[PDB]
Amino acid sequence: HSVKKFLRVRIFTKIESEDDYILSGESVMDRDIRKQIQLLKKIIFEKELMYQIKKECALLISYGVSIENENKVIIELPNEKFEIELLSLDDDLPKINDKRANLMLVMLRLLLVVIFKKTLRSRISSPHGLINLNVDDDILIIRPILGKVRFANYKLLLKKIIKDYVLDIVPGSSITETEVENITKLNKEIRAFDKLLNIPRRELKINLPLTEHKSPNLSLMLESPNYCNALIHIKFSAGTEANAVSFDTTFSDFKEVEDFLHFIVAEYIQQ
């Protein structure tokens, strides 16, 4: 009992009193010579998982990720919070977020496995020698998972902004989002998780009514290059070859996208 610890993740939900959270979900923890090896391997593995996560979280201190206890990290989101804790079986029926806590848990482990695949590949192919790794670069565990959520939030606000500044102003308009040596056995295994590790991006195309002289076209693309922040790309062209304009823009701040959307709709889209 000295140190035999596994990790579970619990999810907290914020409520309408708005002051504090409460617990809406929790991941389960399941209970010869090879069997003692098995338990010892699953033990070291999870201790590694918490170690690396703790290291990655150093980068995320600005993004709502707090490292509180040496065995616990808390990830704060507007309507939810996540706790990832490495704990023994002495301390501490189903519910809403149990399923999600279990998924985040399996995903966490899987992310470490991919890290293992990468180090090994890094060793197989290039070095004739030893690995080289960066926390910022190849250690991604929290970022890919958390990023999926933060992006969804970001995409929500963006659509709100678009409704206000554009959809409500110009009557016919609407919006449509669109999807943007032989080690090969290894690359195929890692490629399979590109789904989880790809930097998130969606393109929001704004449909505008066709003026009979010219057809204006506007679209925005949202992306999270470092997984936790947002970039907004706006392209506008309403060509009349006498009046023809083209804008290609990039913004890190929703405040400026409102100002630029306003500018655009004002001059070019409005009657």
Binding site: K99, R100, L103, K148, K188, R191, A192, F193, K195, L196
Partner: peptide
């Protein structure tokens, strides 16, 4: 293998964000 994984993660990520919300 690969497709199985890509389909499985597609579900996992969807269910985990709960983005559907409609």
């Amino acid at each position: 293998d690969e497709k199985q994984i890509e389909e499985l993660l597609d579900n996992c990520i969807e269910t985990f964000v709960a983005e559907k919300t409609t």
